[PDB]
Write a protein that binds this DNA or RNA. Sequence first.
RNA 1: GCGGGGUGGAGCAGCCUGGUAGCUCGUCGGGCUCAUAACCCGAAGGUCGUCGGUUCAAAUCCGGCCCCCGCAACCA
RNA 2: UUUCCGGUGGCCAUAGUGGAAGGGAAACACCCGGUCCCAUUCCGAACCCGGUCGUUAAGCCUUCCAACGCUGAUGGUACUGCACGAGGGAUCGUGUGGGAGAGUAAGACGCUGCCGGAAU
RNA 3: GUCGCCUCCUAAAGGGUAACGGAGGCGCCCAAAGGUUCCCUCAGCCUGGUUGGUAAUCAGGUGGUGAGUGUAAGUGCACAAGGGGGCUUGACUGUGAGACUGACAGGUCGAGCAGGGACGAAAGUCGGGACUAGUGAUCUGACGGUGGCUUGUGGAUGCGCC
Lengths: 78, 136, 184, 66, 50
Amino acid sequence: ASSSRNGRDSNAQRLGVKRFGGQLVNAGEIIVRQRGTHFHPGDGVGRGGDDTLFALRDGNVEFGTRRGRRVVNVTPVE
Amino acid sequence: MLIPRRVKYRKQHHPKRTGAAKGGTQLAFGDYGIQATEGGYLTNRQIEAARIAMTRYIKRGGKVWINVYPDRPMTKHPAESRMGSGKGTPEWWIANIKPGRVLFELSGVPEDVAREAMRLAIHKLPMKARFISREG
Amino acid sequence: AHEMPRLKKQYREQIRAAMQEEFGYRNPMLIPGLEKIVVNMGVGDAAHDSKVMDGAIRDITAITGQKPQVTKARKSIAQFKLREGQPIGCHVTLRGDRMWEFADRLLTLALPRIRDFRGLNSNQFDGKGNYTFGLSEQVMFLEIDQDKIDRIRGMDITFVTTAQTNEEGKALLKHLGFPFKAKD
Amino acid sequence: MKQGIHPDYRETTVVCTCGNTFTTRSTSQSGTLNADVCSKCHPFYTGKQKILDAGGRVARFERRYG
Amino acid sequence: DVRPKITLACTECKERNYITKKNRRNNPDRMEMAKFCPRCRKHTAHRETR
RNA sequence: GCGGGGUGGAGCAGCCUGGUAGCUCGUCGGGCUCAUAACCCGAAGGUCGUCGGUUCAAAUCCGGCCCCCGCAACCA
RNA sequence: UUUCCGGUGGCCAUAGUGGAAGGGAAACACCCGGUCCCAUUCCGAACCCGGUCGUUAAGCCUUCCAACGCUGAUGGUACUGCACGAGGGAUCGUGUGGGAGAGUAAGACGCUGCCGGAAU
RNA sequence: GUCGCCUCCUAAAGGGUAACGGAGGCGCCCAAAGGUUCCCUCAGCCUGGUUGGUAAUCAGGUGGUGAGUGUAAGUGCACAAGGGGGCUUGACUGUGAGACUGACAGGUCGAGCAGGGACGAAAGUCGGGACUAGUGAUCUGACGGUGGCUUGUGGAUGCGCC
Ligand SMILES: [Mg+2]
Ligand SMILES: [Mg+2]
Ligand SMILES: [Mg+2]
Ligand SMILES: [Mg+2]
Ligand SMILES: [Mg+2]
Ligand SMILES: [Mg+2]
Ligand SMILES: [Mg+2]
Ligand SMILES: [Mg+2]
Ligand SMILES: [Mg+2]
Ligand SMILES: [Mg+2]
Ligand SMILES: [Mg+2]
Ligand SMILES: [Mg+2]
Ligand SMILES: [Mg+2]
Ligand SMILES: [Mg+2]
Ligand SMILES: [Mg+2]
Ligand SMILES: [Mg+2]
Ligand SMILES: [Mg+2]
Ligand SMILES: [Mg+2]
Ligand SMILES: [Mg+2]
Ligand SMILES: [Mg+2]
Ligand SMILES: [Zn+2]
Ligand SMILES: [Zn+2]
């Protein structure tokens, strides 16, 4: 008959933004899982080995632009 | 028979056949033309039959434009076989026609014989079509 | 030693005055002058052995007076039979006093003793006031020896001048003095 | 300049065997330069050859017959 | 087989502190590294075991 | 469908892998003979079925295609 | 206080690209050297050092030019959540909310903060 | 024919989503292709130039990403994560606030701290590699270290821990 040379696929990795704008986060809380820097680390946000953006401090998450880059900041809580 | 030299992917999903014509709803090259009033798939064999009819009727004068191109491949399941075992091999090449799309254009021919040639062509197409002009 | 070269002195006085008078530059620092001299040699038959590169290095070092930059192959090519990163050419950049005295030596000594020398074409400018030409043979530089050269090699000589246009570049290099025929 | 990578390069007299002596600088090891011909000595542009050609095809005819 | 697992032991307290991989063909001889030896409590020279 | 094969004029090597295409016969030129066959001495001869890709580089690696084979195409 | 200019940010083309004209008081710059720290996978070109003569030609600065590019409504259309409807069928229509892309008028030869400079 | 892992599409603008659906990869590699610090900008095109040709090396002009990235693809990266030089071993030991993601086993990220280092004038960065595949639970056995236990005591032997 016939057969397919396809049928392989990788497991779902579950990327994407995990905390949206204004959401209160704790220090170290993961903000976005991603491959490559679609979002760059902004103020109060660190970037991990697999390009995960996480919170360096408590506060509220905001998405903005720092110079020419899309960045994610954590504004310290009032 | 119009067949593309190559395509990126030979096995493709069926083209969307919803909606009106995205573009190319107006004459761009010739004086008269065929405008499809209904959507559908237009195979290269049908395109060739219509083009042969128009050219043969208009004899030596005038020039014909084929606005659409059958660049979408259609696979066919292997005959007499149960469902499954992957997608088939491309067997037909079609163009995605939507209402209002200008299929063929003609220029350099008097209006009456142009109309008759367009009638000959339209009787070979699988969807309803009409003769259009630049308001004369 | 400390002495401003003959060719540099001639350039400054005679050539700067001549250009100022017969091009009418409205600004004093617009008279063109030699910017640099580049001595290249592509020794592409070095993909099979290294001795040819060593000989080329020795020859260019003796001719110019400084160690050459050895360029490795940017990309490998099978029909030229060169791999990636192999040394296939060497070049020297001369500026200032070394530039002036090498140019003086070349013009006064070397190309005069080219076999059946007929001069250099005036139509070998890049189109921006810079003039590059080629020597098919090397030992004609009498600053090197004669009976120890591994093989005959050639080279490319490029004069890069601060000249905006081809005509004024030609005027500058003529005033400096080249053998310029009236042929293509 | 980098020390130890460049050749010996010192004051150098050149004599062209045509009445020309000059004081350039080169790498001529333990010695100077004894040229065979100079620029102002070469027969190229000092104008001492003027070969052009010998195109008198008829001129040859009356040379050997006229 | 071509990139075997090599074990670095400190040359002071002969303790197999680390394990890593070499190329055997690109690095045929035993490899020398300065790593932290927990027993020696400092950075000591580490050598591949024989 | 599975697997193999296509290289001078013919029949066959070169395919783990890239870089140097070989043997036998035949073709062609010269000897030997009265002449032919045989034999002796020299030479040419295939850019590798085709399209495309990989790669610095393809007879060799990969895919499509064409040709030739073999096998399978079963249970009621 | 103002004007002009040099640095250093912010917005990241409404700022760019290209063309034209003009300017240097401080300043910037090219420029002049390489002795000295230092430097070139060769080269005092660059980096670095020493000068500020020369020069506004260029960078830089000012004015001008919608020319390429950029920005860009309103209205309409596509699509669409929900609720229905019509065709033999591809598919299409309506109600009620949302509503582009393109295109059109147009905008635009940048805006703004701090520090320093020379003058007022 | 397929069975685990990775990338894309299908997948309907979070995540997830099946088929013997459509495309490809993986079972490595690198002592630098890791760390750090400083420096650099490509491909293409045009012109001129010994050998030299479309294309080697050189010069000028142009050119912002179309080159490049150890390896698929996507997301990234010209601020370079791309190219080069110097010095190095953090391809660390003891840790992990706080999260991500799975029915679970599990998979992933991680600030801060101490020890002891590398680099940098410093600010600082470094718990392998631009990112995501390059992998196998438990059992049983093995080697190295440690010396917790050892059936009367001391050894031995065996076991435990790492
Ligand atoms: Mg990392
Ligand atoms: Mg990692
Ligand atoms: Mg259009
Ligand atoms: Mg039976
Ligand atoms: Mg608009
Ligand atoms: Mg709009
Ligand atoms: Mg999704
Ligand atoms: Mg959805
Ligand atoms: Mg399901
Ligand atoms: Mg790098
Ligand atoms: Mg390790
Ligand atoms: Mg925790
Ligand atoms: Mg994973
Ligand atoms: Mg520390
Ligand atoms: Mg230090
Ligand atoms: Mg890497
Ligand atoms: Mg790196
Ligand atoms: Mg068991
Ligand atoms: Mg007892
Ligand atoms: Mg431990
Ligand atoms: Zn002479
Ligand atoms: Zn130790």
